[PDB]
Design a protein around this ligand. Sequence first.
Ligand SMILES: CC[C@@H]([NH2+][C@@H](C)CC(N)=O)c1ccc(Cl)c(Oc2ccccc2)c1F
Ligand SMILES: CC[C@@H]([NH2+][C@@H](C)CC(N)=O)c1ccc(Cl)c(Oc2ccccc2)c1F
Lengths: 642, 645
Amino acid sequence: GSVVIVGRIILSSITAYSQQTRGLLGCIITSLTGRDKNQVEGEVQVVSTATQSFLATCVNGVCWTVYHGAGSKTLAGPKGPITQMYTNVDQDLVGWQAPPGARSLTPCTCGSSDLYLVTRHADVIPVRRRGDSRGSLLSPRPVSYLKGSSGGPLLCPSGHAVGIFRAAVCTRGVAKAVDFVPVESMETTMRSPVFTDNSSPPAVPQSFQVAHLHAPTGSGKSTKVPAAYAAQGYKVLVLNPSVAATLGFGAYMSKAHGIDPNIRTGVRTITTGAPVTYSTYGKFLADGGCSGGAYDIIICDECHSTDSTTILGIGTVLDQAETAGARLVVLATATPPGSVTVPHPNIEEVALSNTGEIPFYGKAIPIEAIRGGRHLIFCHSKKKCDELAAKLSGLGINAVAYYRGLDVSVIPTIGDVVVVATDALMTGYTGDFDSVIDCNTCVTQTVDFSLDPTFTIETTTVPQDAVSRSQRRGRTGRGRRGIYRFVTPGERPSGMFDSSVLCECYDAGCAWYELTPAETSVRLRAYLNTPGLPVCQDHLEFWESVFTGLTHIDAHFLSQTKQAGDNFPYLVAYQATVCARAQAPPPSWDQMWKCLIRLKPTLHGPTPLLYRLGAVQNEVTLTHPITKYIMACMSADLEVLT
Amino acid sequence: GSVVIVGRIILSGSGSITAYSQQTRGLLGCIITSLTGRDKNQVEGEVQVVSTATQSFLATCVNGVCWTVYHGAGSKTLAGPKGPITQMYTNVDQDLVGWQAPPGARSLTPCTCGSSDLYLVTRHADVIPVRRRGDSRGSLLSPRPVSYLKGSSGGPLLCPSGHAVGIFRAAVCTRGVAKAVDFVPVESMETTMRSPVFTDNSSPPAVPQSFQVAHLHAPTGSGKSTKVPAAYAAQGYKVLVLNPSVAATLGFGAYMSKAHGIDPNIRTGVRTITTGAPVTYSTYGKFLADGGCSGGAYDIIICDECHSTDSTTILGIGTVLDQAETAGARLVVLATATPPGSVTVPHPNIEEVALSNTGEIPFYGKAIPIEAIRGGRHLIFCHSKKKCDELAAKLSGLGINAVAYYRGLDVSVIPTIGDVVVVATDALMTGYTGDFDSVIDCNTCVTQTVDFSLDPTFTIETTTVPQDAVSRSQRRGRTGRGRRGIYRFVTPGERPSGMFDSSVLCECYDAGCAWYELTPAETSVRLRAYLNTPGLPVCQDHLEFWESVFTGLTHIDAHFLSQTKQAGDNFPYLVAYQATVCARAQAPPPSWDQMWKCLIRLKPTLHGPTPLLYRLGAVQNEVTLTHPITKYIMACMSADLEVLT
Ligand SMILES: CC[C@@H]([NH2+][C@@H](C)CC(N)=O)c1ccc(Cl)c(Oc2ccccc2)c1F
Ligand SMILES: CC[C@@H]([NH2+][C@@H](C)CC(N)=O)c1ccc(Cl)c(Oc2ccccc2)c1F
């Protein structure tokens, strides 16, 4: 639904009190109708979605708030839902046209060094400015003190707006300074295009440039356009996250545009001498990155993907391309950050109900819907894929499960089938289906700086974002009339990724691509600094510090964790090395720790724990030098969500 | 707010046990039904998925009764087809409540097998194998992190035939990992069903021939502290009357002599009088400081306001329950207007008025008009000392006699007498005894909770929370006694009464060590008697954990301890113990909050990281974890703990 105004902070010799204008039932109704006829007052609003509550500040006729709170959502209004006027993901900033009633603040022009921050609990916290977007609290406070107050005003002594609060800067869970969105970033935003055109490939510039191509799969973004560029005599590299897609372009480009391209993947390499090459990001990274002068144009396809190989891959291109003699990088995707799922003309969307013989995430699928034909059911976990595949088989429906680890010949490719899959589908298999049935949830990893003793990487199930919905749905409708069936109608905001993904990049750097933490950092820096890409919290220096301390890994353990293909094979193998040399057992005996299975007869005592990568069942000791090193890294200044 | 059926978990009735869920309601549906308490929907299956506004859990129908946990449902009604269904059973001691199964629900039936192979059904329709250890415990065949079990309290444990062994109430964790499950055995449900649904506790018990413990549930001004001790005295019994507050204790004693003709013994820190009479009024605090029950002194002990879950009251009541029989008492009366499971009911003499946004004085997002308080005697409850002062300032500047009250102030600041507005915390109700024209209530308070945070050990978080039914009724009770009274409020909500946090148990050991020269083991015996006595407020059983922690905190510095004591802050033992550890290391305290003011004078000598034992607030200093006491407490964290699920 829409974001809803649930209260306001009135400003007065500076002071504030809060007024709550709506309760829970009123907030929910108004969020669904998008229709709000209440009187609107003040300069600071207290807003809320169904999940999260936070602040918005009106400046120059615009009610501004944080992207991480509001996403791309409408605001409920006197004449129905209000589409965002401005949406700037790079800056964590959105704006609606302020409705009648709202008074705006004026920008602090002159510029104070002593600022005051207004929280959702009407405190006025004094702040000394340091940078353009940072200020320090004169009195350090706990982090929970500032939660719920993102998008609140940062005010100079006269009461003019300096910026809006976006994030707390913490040292060991204690807020000490604040990142805000400066009022000049807002002004820049009010002057940036109504709608840039990104549905048309760039002309190749005389000097280096970075360009954005927004258009759907099979618009020739990865086929037609490299071929046009090649006809003009340019050498082009197309990068893709998928081995299956990458191999497919070979025979397709031969048949369709009479080019027999170079193909580069972990599983299969083809060198023809063509002026077009298709590679995975992963094989690109294993080849050492950008060859000297081999490519004029590098096309980074599916640049929406926020897996660690794609992010490190694209970062490597953005750090190297210019120096290597390229003239053009192209960031290509259908679902750029900030996007929302639009209705698709060739796809009928229909909610599941509780009528049907097959239960599914609290709803039902009727046997008739999937009895014959070819259908794709998306589930969040491997476990659920096996359960559902087995139920379907019990009823005589031809059905098969697919996820990370299975070979993709579990298919079939032709004839009736229900494929029950995780999102591993979206990189392992190219085919389209008569219908897609979507659970509307995924499994993600999140980092938790839990100081017990260090940090924790949690696996968590979450509601899908708009990229997932649009990509999952796009497995029906490619030149066929499709049907998308779903469990729930919403989608969280697109284009954000967790700090665990940064951690994964360093980890793959060490594990696979022979990168030092410093090299990895430089490349991620390049990605982060480039606008239009997915956004994260800047935790580069913290992660670099951590991995920088993890030396003399055991090559054999590393080889095993890589071979087994699970996540964070460096961190896992590093913990195992520490355990084996300390002659101590691992955190538990889960499959995760199988590199250590043969040593089990002699391993004893408490586990020298570095960090938590799942359930820790053994007793722990914190005496290991490496643990002390990582605990010391936790003193880093960390941006946290607010 | 009613509890609402938002879905069901369907169990297979053949082959091996399997489950699946169905959702019957969205968020909005849920909220509206909770408000109206009226539920159109056909209900099916035996396991229901239920929700309040603040949480979701399970309920299992067994023998025509839909059962769930008290920590989830409190005393709330269930939204049904012809409106709200009130609980048929509210067994707070067993963490068990039940409503009559609505029409359409099937019911499980108990196990006749007596089998030891058990299966737990969760809210995600998983069927977890479990082995039975005792009547109420069962171990997981394979440990799991605690969070996959959350939201599944009230769900069933089945035998291989698919009949009911019990309902899931808590995970037993070792350092954040569940090894076993606490459940409510189907016998406890069987008992309950065969026994009465109503019991009377509204009248003072008869004095029995031999030792008995009895409950007295009756309003304030039914003479529970005055009439009933007077009445027992006049039959020739010796009577001790224990109360949490010095003020209330002195108030009653002077009332006794004026009104009932007895000059009683008084026993408080500030005033102690030995008249030889057969009735004695005392605080729980003075009682404990006197060493408890002295033999042959009393026939009858009245533990008044036995709903208080302050550590001195709990320890006081525990001491009495362990000692009274042997000290030769015949009767212990546990007396309260507001016993566990109680609800705030409409009062005849008091008008209850929602606060609006119409008004000139902001108050917790709402408004107070000056009309409402411009003349007369009025009381405003605020949650913090730091909003009591800021609100009384805004009142004073508006031509108003505003006076703040809170812990750490003299009660003589309250005009007796005068035409006044008092702005105060819950400190009021132990400090002052007068009543008012109206009360205005923010419906929130500051509590403490323990987090088994493992960073490195535990954390005592101070937090703000919605008031419970006790706080509501007690706060409202300061007007409407025998005359007009107005109750104005910000929120109509109200949490379940009678539960208290594990932090309170920690306070009990702390106070034992700091005030009453009890070793942790002595303390455990007293608490054990409290927990084991039916009808009193309830908590999780974390006795061995806490005893084991305080058993290691030896050789505290006497001087620091005396200072944390005198300054009246909470956890004076834990605060002084951290400070002692810090000074003997020449290390600074975790921060320079007033909590650590005993170390301020040593500031010039203190350097390096703090050897952190635990967390009692924010930690600004770098910390080290090598102190042996830190290791001891870390060792104590391997204790097997119930956590809420
Ligand atoms: C305004 C800072 C920007 N981060 C920079 C490092 C640039 C970048 N490439 O991300 C930023 C923009 C938008 C958001 Cl939602 C930010 O915060 C989060 C919070 C949680 C997860 C992901 C991003 C953010 F941190
Ligand atoms: C059935 C266990 C019982 N506890 C025993 C130690 C008896 C007692 N005296 O409390 C119990 C009853 C009711 C509830 Cl809400 C329980 O759980 C909580 C959970 C959190 C806070 C307080 C009690 C409970 F743990």
